[PDB]
Design a protein around this ligand. Sequence first.
Ligand SMILES: CN(C)C(=O)c1cc2cnc(Nc3ccc(N4CCNCC4)cn3)nc2n1C1CCCC1
Length: 291
Amino acid sequence: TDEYQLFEELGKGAFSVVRRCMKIPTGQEYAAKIINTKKLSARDHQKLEREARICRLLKHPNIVRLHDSISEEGFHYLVFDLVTGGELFEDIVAREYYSEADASHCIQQILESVNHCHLNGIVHRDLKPENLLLASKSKGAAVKLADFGLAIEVQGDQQAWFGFAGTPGYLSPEVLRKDPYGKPVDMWACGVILYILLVGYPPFWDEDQHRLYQQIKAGAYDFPSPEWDTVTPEAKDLINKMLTINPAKRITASEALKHPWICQRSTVASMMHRQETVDCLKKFNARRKLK
Ligand SMILES: CN(C)C(=O)c1cc2cnc(Nc3ccc(N4CCNCC4)cn3)nc2n1C1CCCC1
């Protein structure tokens, strides 16, 4: 800990904070989650070691890397390799060309990280734009799935009621019905994200959170004209299969990586520029920054 220098705030939590830090003797930059271990519940104490254990298990080019776990007097540090490219969604709105192919490229990377989570018995439970970063400012920076603070460990394909966790706009139907759930919830979130990547606004939305949940449980999304008239049928097909209410028939991550819009991207995904999507995303990002 004394080996690290702390700088600005990168995030905030109930009993934690995320700060940019640097390894003093070598100058390597990291993102450290600083948890005040003092006056911490037993429940909260198990969640902390569960996050450390989960992050330690995940080594993948599309997942953030845990560098160190540190226990000090009254504080605990979760040190991750720092990614400097910012949010994927903020990078897209800065582009001059953005098409289905780019969205397919992004979702493919997200699907690799989700598939690598599920192959290791880990369900993220909170897939959302804030947790989708870009490795660098380099042209071809890799997408990085971040923040496993809500992730859970599961055995095989055994569902269970693991609790009401996540973000309202991305919650699956089965979590809202308080049914047992598992890996498919991440794939419902990927469906929401993919929808937003194509048109720039969420498939489910309402001022009243109670109406939102009725929309989600009913699968009350559609592909309205005119913006969806130019989206390929294969792109709507992949979304459909992710936003499938029945969790058993919902497409898995390994199946989605073999969908023609993903694996045959160069000949299936449209290359047309979608400026209206860029414009909508700019508004979507602005609304997020308020809350
Ligand atoms: C710490 N934990 C548990 C992680 O999973 C984790 C590993 C991370 C590695 N690199 C970053 N770099 C980074 C991320 C966001 C921003 N901001 C740019 C300006 N506005 C919005 C955000 C700036 N830099 N962040 C990481 N995170 C967290 C992701 C959310 C915050 C910290």
